[PDB]
């Protein structure tokens, strides 16, 4: 089997400027022919995989010629000239040549935005799910950048540990944000038995660290 | 206009059995499919083709001998008999044309993909709870779609109308062993009882579909 290799794993990009990545075979994909059987894919957030480049330099039908492909033999490079918001995505270079057919790791394209500080929420929980034996309370961090964030949840001023899981979205294609939501699930009696309920949220966007809160026994 | 629709996936146990049912229509018995499979959150991983030219078929080290591809041409759908399923395989499947290159043009025409899960669980129908706005404590809101298994919800809102600024977040396992996922909507704040907000679970493997209207 053909081994494809693909560096880096992870491309941060500021839109407007080139972006490379790089694939190697363990074995020459050029035929007896002149073809290089190597394809370059995308994976938008979301959707199936794309043809960008096929037969190693030659551009696919509706792909713009911001998208380029160059190389022959075991080492191939997928360039862009200028990155868009919309290049969101995972890359993957697979070869054609001999079965089976291999795809390399994939290279995760970050869109680098400016700053964004998040939108905090709490969410408490419903009388429907209390009455089940279990509380969700939810916390929402809204359309950030990067995605880099520390969520705690406080009971009471007591950092609670081991009870809650986070959740993040993929960079959106048009704003290039992250959402992320926690949630901190109790039992209804662990619930009753305290009254504050707050999430603090760290992100560098906020100059110091801010707190949503909620006390039970509200509407 | 060419489309392909998979079909077939849900859950088996180890050991057990699936069979995948691509179909297609438009501009199929001429090309060379393939099946590419996906892990939850990995990446893409080649497993199968067959040929148009009869049964020339080739299949990856990982799923030789224990998957068979195959077409139906009197049907128009390409087929993948999925044999002795161990919990690796769960994956996304999709079927797909790879490159066509025909003229001076390559295209390429992948399916919507669906999910095989591998596991001994049960199905299990999820609830849905709502995570309604308030102040004083922009303004957001959602629905909790808890305790579900396997694989996937489908949450919309409005049915399907609204969807500027909805976030549905990928599902999480929680100890239990069940999914859990919550999809918000955030909208302007000054919009208080300017509209309303429903949200539309779908979870097909356990035949549960719940609307759950949320307000304050």
């Known amino acids: 089997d053909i081994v494809m290799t693909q560096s880096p794993l992870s491309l941060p990009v500021t839109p407007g400027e080139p972006a490379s990545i790089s694939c190697r075979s363990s074995?020459?994909?050029?035929?007896?022919?002149?073809?290089?059987?190597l394809d370059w894919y995308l994976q938008k957030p979301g959707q199936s995989p794309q043809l960008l480049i096929y037969?190693?330099?030659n551009r696919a039908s509706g792909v713009p010629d911001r998208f380029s492909g160059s190389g022959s033999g075991t080492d191939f490079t997928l360039k862009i000239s200028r990155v868009e918001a919309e290049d969101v995505g995972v890359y993957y270079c697979?070869?054609?040549?001999?079965?089976?057919?291999?795809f390399g790791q994939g290279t995760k394209l970050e869109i680098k935005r400016t700053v964004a500080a998040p939108s905090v929420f709490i969410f408490p929980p419903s009388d429907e799910q209390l009455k089940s034996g279990t509380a969700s309370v939810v916390c929402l961090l809204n359309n950030f950048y990067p995605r880099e964030a520390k969520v705690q949840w406080k009971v009471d001023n007591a950092l609670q540990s081991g009870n809650s899981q986070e959740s993040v979205t993929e960079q959106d294609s048009k704003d290039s944000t992250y959402s992320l939501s926690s949630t901190l699930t109790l039992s209804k009696a662990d619930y009753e038995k305290h009254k504050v309920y707050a999430c603090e949220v760290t992100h560098q966007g906020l100059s110091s660290p801010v707190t949503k809160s909620f006390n039970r026994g509200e509407c | 206009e060419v489309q392909l629709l998979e079909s077939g996936g849900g859950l088996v146990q180890p050991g057990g059995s699936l069979r995948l049912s691509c179909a297609a229509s438009?501009?199929?018995?001429?090309?060379?499919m393939s099946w590419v499979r996906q892990a939850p959150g990995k990446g893409l991983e080649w497993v199968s083709v067959?040929?148009?030219?009869?049964?020339?078929?080739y299949y990856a080290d990982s799923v030789k001998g224990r998957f068979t591809i195959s077409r139906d041409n009197s049907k128009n759908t390409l087929y993948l008999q999925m044999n002795s399923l161990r919990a690796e395989d769960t994956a996304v499947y999709y079927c797909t044309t790879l490159l066509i290159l025909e003229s001076d043009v390559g295209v390429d025409y992948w399916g919507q993909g669906t999910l095989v899960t591998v596991s001994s669980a049960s199905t299990k129908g999820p609830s849905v709870f709502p995570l309604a706005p308030s102040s004083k404590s922009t303004a957001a809101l959602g629905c909790l779609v808890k305790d579900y298994f396997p694989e996937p919800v489908t949450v919309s809102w409005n049915s399907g109308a609204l969807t500027s600024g909805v976030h549905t977040f990928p599902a999480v396992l929680q100890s239990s062993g069940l999914y859990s996922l919550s999809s918000v909507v955030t909208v302007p704040s000054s919009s208080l009882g300017t509209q309303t907000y429903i949200c539309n679970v779908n979870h097909k493997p356990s035949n549960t579909k719940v609307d759950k209207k949320v307000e304050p």
């Open positions: 037969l190693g330099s």
């Open positions: 074995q020459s994909l050029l035929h007896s022919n002149g073809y290089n059987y």
């Open positions: 697979m070869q054609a040549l001999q079965t089976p057919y291999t």
């Open positions: 438009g501009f199929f018995s001429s090309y060379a």
């Open positions: 067959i040929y148009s030219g009869g049964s020339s078929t």
